[PDB]
Amino acid sequence: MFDPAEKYKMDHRRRGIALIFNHERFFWHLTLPERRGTCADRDNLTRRFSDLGFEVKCFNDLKAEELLLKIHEVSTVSHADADCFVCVFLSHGEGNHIYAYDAKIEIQTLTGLFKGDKCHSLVGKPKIFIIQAARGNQTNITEVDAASVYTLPAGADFLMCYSVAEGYYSHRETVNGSWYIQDLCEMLGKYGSSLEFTELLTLVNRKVSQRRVDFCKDPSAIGKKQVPCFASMLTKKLHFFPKSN
Amino acid sequence: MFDPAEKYKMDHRRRGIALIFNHERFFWHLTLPERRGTCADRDNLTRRFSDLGFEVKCFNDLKAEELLLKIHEVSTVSHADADCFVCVFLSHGEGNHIYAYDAKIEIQTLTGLFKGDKCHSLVGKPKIFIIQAARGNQTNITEVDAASVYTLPAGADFLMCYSVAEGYYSHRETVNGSWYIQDLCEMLGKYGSSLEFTELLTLVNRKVSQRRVDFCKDPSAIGKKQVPCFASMLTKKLHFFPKSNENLYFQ
Ligand SMILES: Oc1cc(F)ccc1CNc1ncccc1-c1ncc[nH]1
Numbered sequence: 015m016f017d018p019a020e021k022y023k024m025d026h027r028r029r030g031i032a033l034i035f036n037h038e039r040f041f042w043h044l045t046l047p048e049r050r051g052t053c054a055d056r057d058n059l060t061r062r063f064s065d066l067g068f069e070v071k072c073f074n075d076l077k078a079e080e081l082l083l084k085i086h087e088v089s090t091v092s093h094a095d096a097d098c099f100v101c102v103f104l105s106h107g108e109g110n111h112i113y114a115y116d117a118k119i120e121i122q123t124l125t126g127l128f129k130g131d132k133c134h135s136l137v138g139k140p141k142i143f144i145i146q147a148a149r150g151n152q153t154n155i156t157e158v159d160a161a162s163v164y165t166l167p168a169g170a171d172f173l174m175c176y177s178v179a180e181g182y183y184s185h186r187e188t189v190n191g192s193w194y195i196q197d198l199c200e201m202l203g204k205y206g207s208s209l210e211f212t213e214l215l216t217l218v219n220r221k222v223s224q225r226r227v228d229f230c231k232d233p234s235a236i237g238k239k240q241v242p243c244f245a246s247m248l249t250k251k252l253h254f255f256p257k258s259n
Numbered sequence: 260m261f262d263p264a265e266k267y268k269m270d271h272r273r274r275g276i277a278l279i280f281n282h283e284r285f286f287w288h289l290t291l292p293e294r295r296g297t298c299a300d301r302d303n304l305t306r307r308f309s310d311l312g313f314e315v316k317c318f319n320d321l322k323a324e325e326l327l328l329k330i331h332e333v334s335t336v337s338h339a340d341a342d343c344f345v346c347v348f349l350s351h352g353e354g355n356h357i358y359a360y361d362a363k364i365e366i367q368t369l370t371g372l373f374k375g376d377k378c379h380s381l382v383g384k385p386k387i388f389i390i391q392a393a394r395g396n397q398t399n400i401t402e403v404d405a406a407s408v409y410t411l412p413a414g415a416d417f418l419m420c421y422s423v424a425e426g427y428y429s430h431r432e433t434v435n436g437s438w439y440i441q442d443l444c445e446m447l448g449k450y451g452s453s454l455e456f457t458e459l460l461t462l463v464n465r466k467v468s469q470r471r472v473d474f475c476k477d478p479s480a481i482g483k484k485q486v487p488c489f490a491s492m493l494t495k496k497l498h499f500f501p502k503s504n505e506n507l508y509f510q
Pocket residue numbers: 161162163164165166167179180181409410411412
């Protein structure tokens with residue numbers, strides 16, 4: 015009795031945790047620009063994910079050691095009573111690395127912690143990573159970075175979500191925050207509870223691609239489009255229906 | 260006017276083309292194994308895509324020059340009257356390369372041909388690439404390769420579909436063909452016309468992950484799972500509803 019309309023079970027006592035690593039400054043000797051606007055993203059996400067029933071936990075400007083500890087901590091805690099896990103990175107990145115305050119971190123190792131091997135509590139449950147990261151270029155101005163981070167998948171039941179794809183460009187308003195996050199959170203607010211999540215992520219792909227970049231106050235920032243992607247290795251439909259309590 | 264249930268328009272006169280590049284042998288001096296079973300995949304796809312209304316066009320064992328020509332040809336023809344475009348690679352691959360008969364080809368350049376810049380006829384229409392490619396290892400046995408090809412996205416309105424993800428392994432029965440393709444085509448046959456395509460691709464992710472690899476006739480082929488992925492850069496729902504062909508020209 016193989017079922018095509020089959021959903022992940024989102025009926026556990028609690029929804030689960032949403033981690034937000036939020037990097038705005040970096041160690042001088044990396045020569046990486048302030049991400050002015052990232053707090054907008056952090057707060058906006060914190061709201062939308064709280065409203066979907068996540069225990070949200072933000073961490074501003076962790077060093078590597080500090081970060082790996084917090085995320086290892088979370089992997090080893092029991093998620094037995096939780097629907098799913100979410101993790102979000104607002105930073106800079108190159109290839110398969112995210113930037114902590116002090117140095118870069120292999121994404122593989124962070125996702126590697128929730129691989130069913132290493133985190134039994136989350137085997138068979140969706141593990142969403144959302145990554146607003148790009149190459150730091152050097153009232154409310156729009157700053158624009160080149161795509162830099164590889165749009166890798168992880169393992170089974172992981173959904174990797176990316177602000178921008180290879181070739182394209184990533185925009186952040188210094189007050190309103192990243193385009194990706196603005197539009198993501200708009201969709202979460204409107205449709206989070208009703209829509210299948212990938213269906214929604216596709217709405218975000220539309221919303222962001224459709225942002226016009228022809229008439230721009232910077233001459234050199236003209237014709238730099240943004241197209242986000244996502245790499246689903248999910249095996250079922252994913253809905254965030256209101257939990258009864 | 261913004262609509263969350265918004266679909267790609269699949270009401271053009273014809274559905275479109277499905278290209279299938281199908282590599283079974285390779286130039287001696289590459290030292291790459293025969294992909295015995297790939298014809299199973301080719302025929303199975305050819306059927307399922309024909310049934311969805313695609314003009315299917317297969318190409319067995321093209322050299323690089325031959326391949327680039329056939330695919331450039333197709334990019335420059337007008338797709339104005341077509342719903343979408345599909346392209347499929349049954350070969351070996353490393354990183355961002357597919358293997359033609361004679362040498363490797365940067366995938367970026369093949370997808371690059373349908374980028375709205377370069378192919379106006381397909382701007383705003385879905386461009387699906389399906390890639391059954393992996394590292395050649397060295398009646399019906401199951402052969403098993405390590406994932407090798409990067410699970411890259413392309414541009415806007417591209418859906419990149421991959422037999423296997425980094426770290427995992429890719430299986431092909433020498434008579435029944437690739438696990439990915441068997442399960443893909445099973446789902447296409449059952450659900451192709453009704454279901455949203457990515458919804459279906461997720462069914463394939465389930466079907467393939469769920470294949471057991473504990474009790475195996477090769478000792479060393481035990482505990483090598485297969486998990487395929489897909490990278491959607493699509494912007495709307497994608498359905499392959501039956502086209503209304505009741506006394507009308509579909510050629
Ligand atoms: O997505 C990108 C973004 C970029 F800025 C530059 C290149 C890409 C595409 N490459 C990949 N895409 C998916 C999985 C792995 C890779 C990868 N690993 C090693 C080299 N490529």
